[PDB]
Curated annotation (Swiss-Prot), chains A, B, C, D, E, F:
A GO cellular component annotation in the UniProt record: T=3 icosahedral viral capsid
Name of this chain's protein: Capsid protein
InterPro entries attached to this UniProt entry: Levivir_coat, Phage_RNA-type_capsid
Function: Capsid protein self-assembles to form an icosahedral capsid with a T=3 symmetry, about 26 nm in diameter, and consisting of 89 capsid proteins dimers (178 capsid proteins). Involved in viral genome encapsidation through the interaction between a capsid protein dimer and the multiple packaging signals present in the RNA genome. The capsid also contains 1 copy of the A2 maturation protein.
Record carries keyword RNA-binding: yes
GO biological process: regulation of translation
């Protein structure tokens, strides 16, 4: 089996889906890259490292690119105009049963689900109010 | 309006929902607390701070608690046996149009959606393979 | 194929089979664990590295946990009272054909078959004599 | 009991099985061997000793020939092209009851049994994937 | 996709083709091997990693036996008389679109294809003239 | 014979085949280039040197150019926006017969055949997985 698999980061269902794929799995760092020029790929990575005696820590980052064409001295190139970076750390005890993990997950999803206040704020370039 | 509102962090639909609510909004730090003893509440926070000249940065953390009862010298108390901590930073340019934000969001959701490899790994206390 | 797959390490007929799943493959160690909290799981790992120019080495490890619930600071936690460790190292010439390997495997099994003396004495808290 | 007796290390159905007999018990180390030039022999050895004041250790080793193209009786150099070596340490807590050992054994059995991934990979001269 | 699958490395028309299968994926390095003593096997491996912040690198290697007078199964020393090694680095700019890569591939194909001079010379144990 | 000959590195049916010609043989590197300005040509090179007393090494390199016109000091010049580099090293025992070589060649081709996974992933901005 694997879970080191291709998947959709972005889902605007059926059409402009941004799919990401196994690039490489260097040092307990799994790298997922969207297709096309790396210069404007999306990227996701993850790792789990044991930190304290009681803790494991996942570390996940995501890169979303604004796409564009750089033109310089009459040479056009695919570049990212900029990128935004999400990056996170999750700590889970050792005593975490599987059910616990589940729960956690849900909480994460939970925070970011559309309509819930984080999720909305970000999408508005806005804060809380 | 507000977006500083109550909401569900955890959704196992209809029944054991973990709902979180406005606690306080101290210094550009919005705090959301589940009900009951704070000693075993879930918690979410967020802030947006402008960091560089071109960047805004959201900072979000979530705390999920393993609930239990501490008993000591015949006194029982509601405590968390432990907690796991998620915590993250998202950086978004200034040039981010609203549509861009949207996209980002989706990517985040995307990473954490059940079945996608992160999401699964965490829930298994597992890594990539 | 992808031989990386779950299997049952402990065959107790059908009732409480300690079955073990893939969990991590970071850095070329294949990790499989049971379905418990990390504080408690069975665990298996495997790896091969190419030692002299004439051999390879498989390295396999097995962790068996005696389970329980300990009370630290008046709270109860899942934990192992102790563990037993198996540890093994195997070296095969390069020139070993596929058949040659099979042999090994069988032999291995031979060693450990229920009723064959090693197998016995281990399980009897005994020495061979 | 008395364990030290012949057994079948390799069970080739009913025919061209290799039984391994007692060959030496010097130093409380049990030696079993097939019937061959020592160059070519299958050999098994095993010893328990107490190690930490919390553990005991069974120490088991198996040597298996390369048989493919082998020439019975020959001076086949260099020996290390011709043999694969197995090596094992099993650490078993002092508290383990007899049952606990059974379990252990089985776990071993488990890891190794045909069609389970270790087993398969060894025999295919393979890694995990 | 999922790429990691068996293929035919050597296409001997339809008969005595050598297919090469997945054998190891440790460290995100893809290993394919024929079905042989490792001494005698065909093997292919491949890895991408990002190198400069302008380049990526695929790193590909192929090992091919000397088969003439070969003795299947044997201890054939010294190994390096018996195998030819191929080695490759492909450096691909970050800007390359998927098409650009296609092209590249083809160029490779090109250099190598039967009846084109590299190809011919290798196979004649030859130089260019 | 004189295998030093032009050939088509890039087979695009019949329409814009990047065909490459002999250009230089100075110092035992065989150079072939496309028909562009030197600032822009595809290029291939090859050489063999006699490494240990037991092997030879072919060294082949391929240069693929992404073409364009840059304006330096308000004048336009033909130039490559970037290049991709292929680089390869091959080692054959001395004892390789002619057949043995053929094998190599084919294998090589095997690697890189359109649809066989290396070939694929390269062209897909992907890793094998």
């Amino acid at each position: 089996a694997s879970n080191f698999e291709e998947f959709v980061l972005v889902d605007n269902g059926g059409t402009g889906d941004v799919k990401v794929a196994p690039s490489n799995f260097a040092n307990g760092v799994a790298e997922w890259i969207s297709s096309n020029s790396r210069s404007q790929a999306y990227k996701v990575t993850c790792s789990v490292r044991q930190s304290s005696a009681n803790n494991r820590k996942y570390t996940v980052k995501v890169e979303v690119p604004k796409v564009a064409t750089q033109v310089q001295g009459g040479v056009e190139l695919p570049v990212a105009a900029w990128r935004s970076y999400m990056n996170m750390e999750l700590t889970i005890p050792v005593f975490a049963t599987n059910d616990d993990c589940a729960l956690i997950v849900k909480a994460l999803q939970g925070t970011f689900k559309t309509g819930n206040p984080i999720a909305t704020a970000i999408a508005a370039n806005s804060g809380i109010y």
